[PDB]
Each structure stands twice: as structure tokens, then as C-alpha cells.
Amino acid sequence: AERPTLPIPDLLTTDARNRIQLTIGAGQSTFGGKTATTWGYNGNLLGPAVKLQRGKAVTVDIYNQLTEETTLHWHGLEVPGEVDGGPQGIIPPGGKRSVTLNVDQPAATCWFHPHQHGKTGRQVAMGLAGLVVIEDDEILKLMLPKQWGIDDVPVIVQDKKFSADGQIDYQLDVMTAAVGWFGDTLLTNGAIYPQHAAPRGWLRLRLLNGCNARSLNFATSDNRPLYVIASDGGLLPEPVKVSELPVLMGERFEVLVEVNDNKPFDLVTLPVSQMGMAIAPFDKPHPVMRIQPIAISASGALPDTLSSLPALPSLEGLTVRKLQLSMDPMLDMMGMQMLMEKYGDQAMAGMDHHMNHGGKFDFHHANKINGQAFDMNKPMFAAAKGQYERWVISGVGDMMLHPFHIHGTQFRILSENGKPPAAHRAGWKDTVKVEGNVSEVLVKFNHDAPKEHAYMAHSHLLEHQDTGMMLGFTVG
Numbered sequence: 001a002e003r004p005t006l007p008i009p010d011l012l013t014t015d016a017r018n019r020i021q022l023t024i025g026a027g028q029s030t031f032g033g034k035t036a037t038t039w040g041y042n043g044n045l046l047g048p049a050v051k052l053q054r055g056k057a058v059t060v061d062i063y064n065q066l067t068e069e070t071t072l073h074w075h076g077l078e079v080p081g082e083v084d085g086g087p088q089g090i091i092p093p094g095g096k097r098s099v100t101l102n103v104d105q106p107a108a109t110c111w112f113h114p115h116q117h118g119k120t121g122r123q124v125a126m127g128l129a130g131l132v133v134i135e136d137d138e139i140l141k142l143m144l145p146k147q148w149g150i151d152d153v154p155v156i157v158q159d160k161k162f163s164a165d166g167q168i169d170y171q172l173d174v175m176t177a178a179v180g181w182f183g184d185t186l187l188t189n190g191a192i193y194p195q196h197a198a199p200r201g202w203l204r205l206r207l208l209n210g211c212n213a214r215s216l217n218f219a220t221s222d223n224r225p226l227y228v229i230a231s232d233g234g235l236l237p238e239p240v241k242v243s244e245l246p247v248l249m250g251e252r253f254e255v256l257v258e259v260n261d262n263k264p265f266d267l268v269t270l271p272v273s274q275m276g277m278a279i280a281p282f283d284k285p286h287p288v289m290r291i292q293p294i295a296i297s298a299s300g301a302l303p304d305t306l307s308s309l310p311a312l313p314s315l316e317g318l319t320v321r322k323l324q325l326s327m328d329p330m331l332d333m334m335g336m337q338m339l340m341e342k343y344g345d346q347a348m349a350g351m352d353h354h355m356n357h358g359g360k361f362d363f364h365h366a367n368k369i370n371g372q373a374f375d376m377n378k379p380m381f382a383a384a385k386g387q388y389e390r391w392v393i394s395g396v397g398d399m400m401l402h403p404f405h406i407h408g409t410q411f412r413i414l415s416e417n418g419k420p421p422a423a424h425r426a427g428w429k430d431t432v433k434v435e436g437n438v439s440e441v442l443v444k445f446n447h448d449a450p451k452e453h454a455y456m457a458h459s460h461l462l463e464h465q466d467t468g469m470m471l472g473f474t475v476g
């Protein structure tokens with residue numbers, strides 16, 4: 001059989017009432033010929049791409065048609081806590097919540113997903129994620145590839161695992177609370193190994209790692225380069241040529257890749273050095289999608305300069321906040337031993353060379369920041385508004401991967417896990433790697449967040465977030 005075409009999320013803009021309608025619901029999808037119950041926004045799986053313009057407000061009406069509570073967070077969008085959709089932003093089953101978003105940041109590819117307390121990993125795994133395309137006046141002047149679904153395409157890459165009956169097999173248990181939920185099946189906008197027909201010239205891919213716990217590393221099957229033009233929070237100052245592109249959970253990058261007649265190639269993900277993630281079929285480069293060249297000229301450009309990136313300021317006198325991540329040693333060892341028992345030595349490939357004792361030992365609050373598992377009732381601190389701060393995030397104490405995300409901001413990385421950031425990671429970011437070492441980021445919050453609707457800061461390894469590796473903080 002030929003490959004299926006890459007599904008393209010609809011690009012949604014406002015109605016005359018200036019509203020966008022999102023319905024959250026359950027439906028059915030098919031994977032490898034077997035039906036599965038899945039959840040989607042405005043459909044059975046995944047979601048549309050909401051298009052937003054800097055300096056314009058839009059109202060979003062969000063209808064929860066699930067039979068359980070959910071929330072909707074705009075990952076990467078800088079909005080007041082009241083509309084951020086963290087775990088306090090409950091939408092009752094059968095209810096509706098509306099938010100007005102006043103977009104106040106540069107062009108970027110952001111995304112949106114649930115943030116239900118303790119259940120974010122399951123609700124993402126069941127299918128909920130969508131995209132956000134922010135435009136501004138500056139980016140349109142660059143004449144980048146811009147035909148949605150033709151030469152400008154979103155690529156949401158996610159793994160799943162399924163039980164023998166075809167259903168999604170999600171469990172938050174000691175092993176996945178330790179290593180994360182991951183699977184053996186890779187989806188690209190919900191489809192298994194699709195093809196995308198692209199015109200000759202430049203193809204723009206808006207890459208999102210939407211996996212719960214798996215890190216990815218994109219490359220091409222014939223080693224043509226990727227030109228990074230944008231990170232989580234928008235354009236880089238100039239393109240950065242790379243041969244491979246590591247992407248942590250929740251991160252976005254936009255790249256341009258050349259398309260030449262008669263020479264199809266795959267986008268692939270290369271094996272990563274993360275516990276559990278190099279079990280077959282991920283022990284080898286894994287195709288993500290086939291790019292099928294079409295002998296029609298693509299009009300987009302790769303300009304020499306993309307945007308202005310301001311200088312880091314002086315760090316002297318800035319507030320320094322320390323965030324110590326931690327895992328329970330006993331439960332980390334128990335979860336890792338179950339992984340090893342299940343899959344054997346392959347569960348550590350690529351890495352560097354039973355009774356009930358009560359609630360004190362419960363893995364649901366095993367992961368912590370500054371000695372506390374997430375307490376929705378107690379923001380850990382009150383950050384300054386409109387002031388730069390230096391947040392220092394330490395993973396010393398364990399060797400698991402912690403992609404650390406801070407709501408409410410796009411920051412600058414000063415140190416990523418003990419090294420200055422790579423050039424394509426030196427612009428606007430909302431995620432920073434922490435693994436065995438220490439990161440430092442320069443953040444500023446332009447909007448208020450009160451105790452009742454606090455901003456979150458957390459690991460975006462969802463099973464760790466859900467089992468306590470998150471804090472709340474207020475601004476203003």
C-alpha cells in the first residue's frame with residue numbers, strides 16, 4: 001500500500017463575533033487497521049491550528065464534551081494566569097469556558113493541550129493537542145514558505161502504545177511514573193509514516209515533539225541539512241544550519257529543508273540517549289514522514305536575516321531563584337528495575353558507560369521541586385512582573401531527563417545543563433534541558449497571575465509532572 005498523506009490540521013481564525021469554537025470530545029481513530037477510542041479538539045484526534053495575530057484579541061469558547069474534567073493551556077503563549085489554563089482552569093464535563101486572549105508576543109508556533117491536575121499525561125496520550133500559529137507584521141515581510149498544508153506544514157510527532165485489542169494502553173504506575181509513558185508506534189499528525197507532497201524549493205516544517213516522555217532528534221535520510229529558522233518563542237536572528245535537531249517534549253522548532261525533483265527523502269528521528277527510548281524500533285533511525293517532491297516551483301525564501309535578537313542584559317543584581325528538582329530514590333530504582341526486567345539491557349542502550357506501606361510511600365507524590373510535590377493550594381513563590389529574573393534549575397541527584405518549562409514567558413537560556421546553549425537554542429525558549437546538571441534561564445513575566453490561577457513551572461515529562469514535579473507561582 002502507498003503511504004497515507006500527511007493529515008493537515010485546519011487553520012482556524014475568528015468569526016464576526018470574534019470567536020473560535022473548540023469542542024473537546026471522544027471519538028474513534030484507526031491505527032494499523034484497528035479502531036481505538038481517542039480524544040480530539042474539533043474532531044477525533046489532535047486538533048486544529050488556531051491562528052492568532054500580535055496585537056489582536058480573540059475569544060475562544062471551549063466546550064468540554066468529555067465525561068471528565070479538563071483544562072486547556074496555551075503552551076508558549078504569554079497570557080495572564082486567569083486564562084492560562086493550568087490545573088486550576090477547570091472546565092466541567094458538559095460545560096463551557098471562554099477565554100479572551102490578547103496576543104502580545106512575536107510570531108511563533110505555539111501549541112495547546114490539557115493541564116488537568118494529575119492526569120495531563122493520560123489526556124495528552126488519549127489524543128488531545130492542537131497548534132497555535134502566531135503571526136505579526138515582521139514575519140510576513142520575510143516571504144517564507146507560507147502555503148498551509150503545501151510548503152508550510154505542521155509536523156506533530158508522538159509515540160503511543162496500544163493493547164492487543166487496539167485501544168491506547170495508558171497507565172500511570174510505578175514504572176511509568178519513573179521512566180515516562182512511551183510506546184512502539186510513532187505518529188505524525190496522528191498517522192503512521194505518512195507522505196507529504198511538497199513543491200520544489202523550500203519546505204517549511206513546524207516541528208512539535210508532542211510525546212509524553214520521549215525525546216526526539218530529527219534528521220533527513222540522505223543527510224541534507226535542516227535550516228532552523230525558529231524556536232519555541234519565535235524566529236532566530238538568522239538561520240542556523242544543522243545536520244540533526246534534538247527536540248525535547250513540548251518544544252517546537254521551525255526548519256526549512258530543500259526539496260529537489262525526483263528525490264524523495266524521509267524526515268527521520270535518530271536514536272536518543274534516554275532511558276527506555278532506544279528499544280526497537282527506536283534503536284535505529286526511525287522514519288517520521290516521506291517528503292515526495294512535486295515538479296512545481298515553491299515560492300518561499302530562506303532569507304539571510306530573520307529578526308533582531310536583543311542582547312542579554314547584565315545579570316548583576318537580578319533575583320536568583322533556585323529550583324531543585326528531585327525524584328524519590330527508592331521509587332526511581334523500583335521503576336528503573338521494572339524497565340530493565342521487562343526489556344533488558346536494551347532499555348539502557350546509548351547511555352553513558354512489594355507491600356503497602358501507606359501514603360508516605362505513594363508514587364503519586366514521589367517527584368518534587370524544592371522538597372515539595374506540587375501543591376495546587378500553595379504557590380511556592382511570588383515572582384516579579386516586568387523584571388528579569390535568573391532561575392536556576394538543578395537536576396543534580398538523578399540522571400533522568402527533565403525538560404523544564406515555565407508558563408507565562410519566553411525566556412533566554414544562559415546555561416543549558418552546564419554548557420552555553422547551542423546557537424539554535426539561544427533565542428526565545430520556553431523549555432530548557434535539565435539532566436544530571438544545572439540550567440539557568442533569564443525570564444521576564446509581562447502578565448499577572450494570582451494564587452487562584454497561578455502559573456506552573458514543571459518538567460514536561462508528563463508522568464513526572466503528574467506525580468509532583470511542578471510548582472505554582474504568582475506574578476504581580
Ligand SMILES: [Cu+2]
Pocket residue numbers: 073074075076405406407408
Ligand atoms: Cu506552558
Ligand SMILES: [Cu+2]
Pocket residue numbers: 075113250405460
Ligand atoms: Cu506544556
Ligand SMILES: [Cu+2]
Pocket residue numbers: 073075115405407456458
Ligand atoms: Cu504546562
Ligand SMILES: [O]
Pocket residue numbers: 073074075076405407
Ligand atoms: O505548558
Ligand SMILES: [O]
Pocket residue numbers: 073075115405460
Ligand atoms: O505543560
